[PDB]
Amino acid sequence: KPSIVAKLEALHERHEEVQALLGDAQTIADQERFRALSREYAQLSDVSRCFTDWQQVQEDIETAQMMLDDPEMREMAQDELREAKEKSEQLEQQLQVDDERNAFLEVRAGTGGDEAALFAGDLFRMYSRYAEARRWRVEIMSASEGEHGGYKEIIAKISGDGVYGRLKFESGGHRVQRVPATESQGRIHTSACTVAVMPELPDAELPDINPADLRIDTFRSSGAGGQHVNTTDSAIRITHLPTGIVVECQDERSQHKNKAKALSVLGARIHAAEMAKRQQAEASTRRNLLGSGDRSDRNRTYNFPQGRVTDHRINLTLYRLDEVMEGKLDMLIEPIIQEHQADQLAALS
Amino acid sequence: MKVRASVKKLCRNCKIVKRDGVIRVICSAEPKHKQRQG
Amino acid sequence: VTSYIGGEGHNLQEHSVILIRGGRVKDLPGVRYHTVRGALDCSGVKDRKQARSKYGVKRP
Amino acid sequence: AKKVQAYVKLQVAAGMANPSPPVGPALGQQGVNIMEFCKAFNAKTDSIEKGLPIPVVITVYADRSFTFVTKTPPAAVLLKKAAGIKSGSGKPNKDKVGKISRAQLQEIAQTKAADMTGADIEAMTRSIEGTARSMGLVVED
Amino acid sequence: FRRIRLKDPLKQKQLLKGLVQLSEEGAVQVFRPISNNDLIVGAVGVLQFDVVVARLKSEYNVEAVYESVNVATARWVECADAKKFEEFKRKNESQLALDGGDNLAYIATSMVNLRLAQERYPDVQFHQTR
RNA sequence: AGCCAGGAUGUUGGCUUAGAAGCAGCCAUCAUUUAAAGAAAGCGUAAUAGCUCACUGGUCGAGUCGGCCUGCGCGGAAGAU
Ligand SMILES: [Mg+2]
Ligand SMILES: [Mg+2]
Ligand SMILES: [Mg+2]
Ligand SMILES: [Mg+2]
Ligand SMILES: [Mg+2]
Ligand SMILES: [Zn+2]
């Protein structure tokens, strides 16, 4: 706990400050601020209480050691084991606490070409094994095989309870440094892959053709029709008040046919506009989440010569790459979530 | 004053009164409850 | 034009006035000038004890 | 007696002075001093128990001076240490949270019988028992 | 306080000189928080600030706009005798500043925050210089 | 029907959330002093506080309050020489 202790110290200080801020009757006159402070106080108080208990236990551990004579092993051992247990309880309790919906996982090659495909296949196998040893379900929707090895792009759907809340930190770039299979000599090569995780969201579409927000104009058509085209209102025009689209029809001699045709065309135009809006929003979100595989923008690195996996977002290096490549990356995602939660409490101003 | 074809008592203070052949509702508590049948 | 910001860490952002001078960064295609550190709205490199005058750091 | 002037009854467990939201802003807008209850209120606290909510009165005059009187802890929290239960009801008929022995409640009724009413002790047994069936408890014979 | 921002960011000379030539005669004070880069502007009351803005707009030709900012009071902190001052200049690094005369300043955010932040860090925090 | 008076007791309840205290919503809806008083029909508070109503004593002093079968009338009811 090298850096998270600083965050918890700042959290405790802010908890004390907001505790003091509630007893002056000058910030209680307004109601929105009072309610905001009241909502802010709860989590701060709980986490601060647990952290103060941990800090006092640690300070006790620091003392009662720099002496001799008595066999101080037993009390030190019991104190440190209870400290570790309390620390584990604290981290879990402020890490858990919504958002547990299914997810879409897609990985594609970056720098490297025929070996980035192999690394993408390996990474997908890792994620699949992780999902399988969680009672989740993974099914492949789109696959583009990569000539020599794995996939140039794989898009699959993972379904379960708690999916997105744990796989939302894998979106980014993953760098691998190792000896490729497609290598005549014995050179080491650096390549990258890009991963995107996106939550599952519905597709609620409604017939927005409520006639209470439509303007209908009926008038005379223009063309060659004799003495009947003159004295008849056969042309129709519908204006949609919310969106502002206008559709005019004077195809056939019957007003009802024109009305039906123009209403259908207006509905089709509204549907197309809405679908285009959703598509562009999703495309922009995916572009920002994905990045650009260039072995220089990355979230984690895998070194096979040294067998080391490192995470640059929290600056955490570990030497258990063989377990990680076997779907045991729960020892990688938990430290991130913790650091992702202390900020959420700290971002309450 | 709501002009409607069906005037009813809406609270405990509403009273039915007929003035010049027009049935109307008046209550001392809520001024929103006064209506005229028309 | 495009200018290069040397040293470790800068406080620059949009709408900041700076002083630039000549000097070409080779492996950067299109960069042809250098930002003078210690100038109007750019501060010297923090905790720099060597070659201070090239990065506008006061002597401690 | 004097009618309500500035006082309403509300207080968390006496055990700690704990100038928390339930006690601080409850009287912070009335003025007075919040930290001062660490001595005035806690003088009677340390005798009874650590962690029992005792209701108090916060009668305060315009001179920013107060005076307080306490009562027995409410019967709802009384059947939490004598029942082994800290959660509560929510389907008091569909399910139940625990059991209470019929001989346990009345032996504690006299603690609240100072301000509880009734013709005699046996009368007050139904009052403490009638409220118990709403909590989800079951009387044990 | 009311920090400053002017429309054209290149005609910023006259606001950087018309504010060192007008804090030389006790009309305005120019803090500059350490973390970001602002030009926060002290005053003792509304009328003094009104005089400053009208004078700065008429004499020096500076078209600017003055946002508000949430700050209660500043305090000049100067205690270099010990070493704990060095760590105080780090733990509370978020809301310190630098005057025109380079004296530090604990730009508070409320009376409660200040009244707390001098209950610990038992160093001197007075409110006058020169 | 008007008019005097009461309209109480450990629910600051776990349930739920920052507070929900008769009155946001979810289950239950007993007991005590009683002549009567809902573990609440309505208004009102951020939550309290505050004001009424069901029910009950007093005055008053003789009729009073709702349905059914039916006759005739009222409103609903705005157009162009
Ligand atoms: Mg023809
Ligand atoms: Mg015709
Ligand atoms: Mg008239
Ligand atoms: Mg008729
Ligand atoms: Mg006519
Ligand atoms: Zn009415």
Coordinates of N, CA and C in Angstrom, one line a residue, chain E residues 12-128:
Chain E
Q12 N -2.1 40.7 -24.1 CA -2.0 40.5 -22.6 C -0.9 41.2 -21.9
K13 N -0.1 42.0 -22.7 CA 0.9 42.8 -22.1 C 0.3 43.9 -21.2
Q14 N -0.6 44.6 -21.7 CA -1.2 45.7 -20.9 C -1.9 45.3 -19.6
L15 N -2.4 44.0 -19.6 CA -2.9 43.5 -18.3 C -1.9 43.0 -17.4
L16 N -0.7 42.6 -17.9 CA 0.4 42.2 -17.1 C 1.3 43.3 -16.6
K17 N 1.2 44.4 -17.2 CA 1.9 45.6 -16.7 C 1.0 46.6 -16.0
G18 N -0.2 46.8 -16.5 CA -1.2 47.6 -15.9 C -1.7 47.0 -14.6
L19 N -1.1 45.9 -14.2 CA -1.4 45.2 -12.9 C -0.2 45.1 -12.0
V20 N 1.0 45.4 -12.5 CA 2.2 45.6 -11.7 C 2.5 47.1 -11.5
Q21 N 1.9 47.9 -12.3 CA 2.0 49.4 -12.1 C 0.9 49.9 -11.3
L22 N -0.1 49.1 -10.9 CA -1.2 49.5 -10.2 C -1.4 48.7 -8.9
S23 N -0.5 47.7 -8.7 CA -0.3 47.1 -7.4 C 0.9 47.7 -6.7
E24 N 1.6 48.7 -7.3 CA 2.7 49.4 -6.7 C 2.2 50.6 -5.9
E25 N 0.9 50.8 -5.8 CA 0.4 52.0 -5.1 C -0.8 51.5 -4.2
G26 N -0.9 50.3 -3.8 CA -1.9 49.8 -2.9 C -3.3 49.9 -3.4
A27 N -3.6 49.5 -4.6 CA -5.0 49.5 -5.1 C -5.5 48.1 -5.4
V28 N -4.6 47.1 -5.6 CA -4.9 45.8 -6.0 C -3.8 44.8 -5.5
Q29 N -4.1 43.6 -5.4 CA -3.1 42.5 -5.0 C -3.3 41.4 -6.0
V30 N -2.2 40.8 -6.4 CA -2.3 39.8 -7.5 C -1.7 38.5 -7.0
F31 N -2.6 37.6 -6.5 CA -2.2 36.2 -6.2 C -2.0 35.4 -7.5
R32 N -1.3 34.3 -7.4 CA -1.0 33.4 -8.5 C -0.9 32.0 -8.0
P33 N -2.0 31.2 -7.9 CA -1.9 29.9 -7.3 C -0.9 29.0 -8.0
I34 N -0.3 28.1 -7.2 CA 0.9 27.4 -7.6 C 0.5 26.4 -8.7
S35 N -0.5 25.6 -8.4 CA -0.8 24.4 -9.3 C -1.1 24.9 -10.7
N36 N -2.3 25.6 -10.8 CA -2.7 26.1 -12.1 C -2.0 27.4 -12.3
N37 N -2.5 28.2 -13.3 CA -1.9 29.5 -13.7 C -3.0 30.5 -13.9
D38 N -3.3 31.2 -12.9 CA -4.4 32.2 -12.9 C -3.8 33.6 -12.6
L39 N -4.7 34.6 -12.4 CA -4.3 35.9 -12.0 C -5.3 36.5 -11.0
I40 N -5.6 35.7 -10.0 CA -6.6 36.1 -9.0 C -6.3 37.5 -8.5
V41 N -7.3 38.2 -8.1 CA -7.2 39.6 -7.8 C -7.8 40.0 -6.5
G42 N -7.0 40.3 -5.5 CA -7.5 40.6 -4.2 C -8.2 42.0 -4.1
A43 N -8.9 42.2 -3.0 CA -9.5 43.5 -2.7 C -10.1 43.4 -1.3
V44 N -10.3 44.5 -0.6 CA -10.8 44.5 0.7 C -12.3 44.7 0.7
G45 N -12.9 45.1 -0.4 CA -14.3 45.3 -0.5 C -14.8 45.5 -1.9
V46 N -16.1 45.7 -2.1 CA -16.6 45.8 -3.4 C -16.1 47.1 -4.1
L47 N -16.1 48.2 -3.3 CA -15.9 49.5 -4.0 C -14.5 49.6 -4.5
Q48 N -13.5 49.1 -3.7 CA -12.1 49.1 -4.2 C -11.9 48.3 -5.5
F49 N -12.6 47.2 -5.6 CA -12.5 46.4 -6.8 C -13.2 47.2 -8.0
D50 N -14.3 47.9 -7.7 CA -14.9 48.7 -8.7 C -14.0 49.7 -9.3
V51 N -13.3 50.4 -8.3 CA -12.3 51.4 -8.7 C -11.2 50.8 -9.6
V52 N -10.7 49.6 -9.2 CA -9.6 48.9 -9.9 C -10.1 48.6 -11.3
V53 N -11.3 48.0 -11.5 CA -11.7 47.6 -12.8 C -11.9 48.8 -13.7
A54 N -12.6 49.8 -13.2 CA -12.8 51.0 -14.1 C -11.5 51.7 -14.5
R55 N -10.6 51.8 -13.5 CA -9.3 52.4 -13.8 C -8.5 51.6 -14.8
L56 N -8.5 50.3 -14.6 CA -7.7 49.4 -15.5 C -8.3 49.4 -16.9
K57 N -9.6 49.5 -17.0 CA -10.2 49.6 -18.3 C -10.0 50.9 -19.0
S58 N -10.0 52.0 -18.3 CA -9.9 53.3 -18.9 C -8.5 53.7 -19.2
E59 N -7.6 53.6 -18.3 CA -6.3 54.1 -18.5 C -5.4 53.2 -19.4
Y60 N -5.5 51.9 -19.2 CA -4.6 51.0 -19.9 C -5.2 50.3 -21.1
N61 N -6.5 50.4 -21.4 CA -7.2 49.8 -22.5 C -7.1 48.3 -22.4
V62 N -7.7 47.7 -21.4 CA -7.8 46.2 -21.2 C -9.2 45.8 -21.2
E63 N -9.7 45.1 -22.2 CA -11.0 44.6 -22.3 C -11.0 43.2 -21.7
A64 N -11.5 43.0 -20.6 CA -11.5 41.7 -19.9 C -12.8 41.3 -19.3
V65 N -12.9 40.1 -18.8 CA -14.1 39.6 -18.1 C -13.6 38.9 -16.8
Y66 N -14.4 39.1 -15.7 CA -13.9 38.7 -14.4 C -14.9 37.6 -13.9
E67 N -14.5 36.4 -13.9 CA -15.3 35.3 -13.3 C -15.2 35.4 -11.8
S68 N -16.2 34.8 -11.2 CA -16.1 34.7 -9.7 C -15.2 33.5 -9.4
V69 N -14.9 33.4 -8.1 CA -14.1 32.3 -7.6 C -14.5 32.1 -6.1
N70 N -14.5 30.9 -5.6 CA -15.0 30.6 -4.3 C -13.8 30.6 -3.3
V71 N -13.5 31.7 -2.7 CA -12.5 31.8 -1.7 C -12.9 32.8 -0.6
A72 N -12.7 32.5 0.6 CA -13.2 33.3 1.7 C -12.1 34.4 2.1
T73 N -11.0 34.0 2.5 CA -9.9 34.9 2.9 C -8.6 34.3 2.6
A74 N -7.6 35.2 2.4 CA -6.2 34.8 2.3 C -5.5 35.1 3.6
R75 N -4.3 34.4 3.8 CA -3.5 34.6 5.0 C -2.1 34.4 4.6
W76 N -1.2 35.3 4.9 CA 0.2 35.2 4.6 C 0.9 34.3 5.7
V77 N 1.4 33.1 5.2 CA 2.1 32.2 6.1 C 3.6 32.2 5.9
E78 N 4.3 32.5 6.9 CA 5.8 32.6 6.8 C 6.4 32.0 8.1
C79 N 6.8 30.8 8.0 CA 7.5 30.1 9.2 C 8.5 29.1 8.6
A80 N 9.7 29.6 8.5 CA 10.8 28.7 7.9 C 11.7 28.2 8.9
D81 N 11.4 28.4 10.2 CA 12.4 28.0 11.3 C 12.6 26.5 11.3
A82 N 11.5 25.7 11.1 CA 11.6 24.3 11.3 C 11.5 23.6 9.9
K83 N 11.4 22.2 10.0 CA 11.3 21.4 8.8 C 9.9 21.0 8.5
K84 N 9.0 20.9 9.5 CA 7.6 20.6 9.2 C 7.0 21.6 8.3
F85 N 7.5 22.8 8.2 CA 7.0 23.7 7.2 C 7.2 23.2 5.8
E86 N 8.3 22.5 5.5 CA 8.5 22.0 4.2 C 7.5 21.0 3.8
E87 N 7.1 20.1 4.7 CA 6.0 19.1 4.4 C 4.7 19.7 4.4
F88 N 4.4 20.8 5.2 CA 3.2 21.5 5.1 C 3.0 22.2 3.7
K89 N 4.1 22.7 3.1 CA 4.1 23.2 1.8 C 3.8 22.1 0.7
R90 N 3.7 20.9 1.1 CA 3.4 19.8 0.2 C 2.0 19.1 0.5
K91 N 1.7 18.9 1.8 CA 0.4 18.3 2.1 C -0.7 19.2 1.7
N92 N -0.6 20.5 1.9 CA -1.6 21.5 1.5 C -1.2 22.3 0.3
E93 N -0.5 21.6 -0.7 CA 0.0 22.3 -1.9 C -1.1 22.7 -2.8
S94 N -2.4 22.2 -2.6 CA -3.4 22.5 -3.5 C -3.8 24.0 -3.5
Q95 N -3.8 24.6 -2.3 CA -4.4 25.9 -2.2 C -3.4 26.9 -1.6
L96 N -2.2 27.0 -2.1 CA -1.2 28.0 -1.8 C -1.1 29.0 -3.0
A97 N -0.3 30.0 -2.8 CA -0.3 31.0 -3.9 C 1.1 31.8 -3.8
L98 N 1.2 32.8 -4.6 CA 2.4 33.7 -4.6 C 1.9 35.1 -4.9
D99 N 2.3 36.0 -4.1 CA 1.8 37.4 -4.3 C 2.6 38.1 -5.4
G100 N 2.4 39.4 -5.5 CA 3.4 40.2 -6.3 C 4.8 40.2 -5.6
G101 N 4.8 40.3 -4.3 CA 6.0 40.3 -3.5 C 6.5 39.0 -3.1
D102 N 6.1 37.9 -3.7 CA 6.5 36.6 -3.6 C 6.3 36.0 -2.2
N103 N 5.6 36.7 -1.3 CA 5.2 36.1 0.0 C 4.1 35.0 -0.3
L104 N 4.3 33.9 0.4 CA 3.3 32.8 0.3 C 2.0 33.3 0.8
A105 N 0.9 32.5 0.6 CA -0.4 32.8 1.1 C -1.3 31.6 1.1
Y106 N -1.9 31.4 2.2 CA -2.8 30.2 2.4 C -4.2 30.6 1.9
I107 N -4.5 30.6 0.6 CA -5.8 31.0 0.1 C -6.8 30.0 0.6
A108 N -7.6 30.4 1.6 CA -8.5 29.5 2.3 C -9.7 29.3 1.4
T109 N -10.7 28.6 1.9 CA -12.0 28.4 1.2 C -13.2 28.6 2.1
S110 N -13.0 28.8 3.4 CA -14.1 29.1 4.3 C -13.4 29.4 5.7
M111 N -14.2 30.0 6.6 CA -13.6 30.2 7.9 C -13.4 28.9 8.6
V112 N -14.2 27.9 8.3 CA -14.0 26.6 9.0 C -12.7 25.9 8.5
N113 N -12.5 26.0 7.2 CA -11.3 25.3 6.7 C -10.0 25.9 7.2
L114 N -10.0 27.3 7.3 CA -8.8 27.9 7.9 C -8.7 27.6 9.4
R115 N -9.8 27.8 10.1 CA -9.8 27.6 11.6 C -9.4 26.1 11.9
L116 N -9.6 25.2 11.0 CA -9.0 23.9 11.1 C -7.6 23.8 10.8
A117 N -7.2 24.3 9.6 CA -5.8 24.2 9.1 C -4.9 25.0 9.9
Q118 N -5.2 25.8 10.9 CA -4.2 26.3 11.8 C -4.4 25.8 13.2
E119 N -5.3 24.9 13.4 CA -5.4 24.1 14.7 C -4.3 23.0 14.7
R120 N -4.1 22.4 13.5 CA -2.8 21.6 13.3 C -1.9 22.5 12.5
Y121 N -0.7 22.0 12.2 CA 0.4 22.8 11.6 C 0.7 24.0 12.4
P122 N 1.0 23.9 13.7 CA 1.1 25.1 14.5 C 2.2 26.0 14.2
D123 N 2.1 26.7 13.0 CA 3.0 27.8 12.6 C 2.1 29.0 12.5
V124 N 2.9 30.1 12.2 CA 2.3 31.5 12.3 C 1.5 31.7 11.0
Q125 N 0.3 32.3 11.1 CA -0.6 32.7 10.0 C -1.2 34.0 10.3
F126 N -0.5 35.1 10.0 CA -1.0 36.5 10.1 C -1.4 37.0 8.8
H127 N -2.0 38.2 8.8 CA -2.7 38.8 7.7 C -2.2 40.2 7.4
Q128 N -0.9 40.5 7.4 CA -0.4 41.8 7.0 C 1.0 41.7 6.7

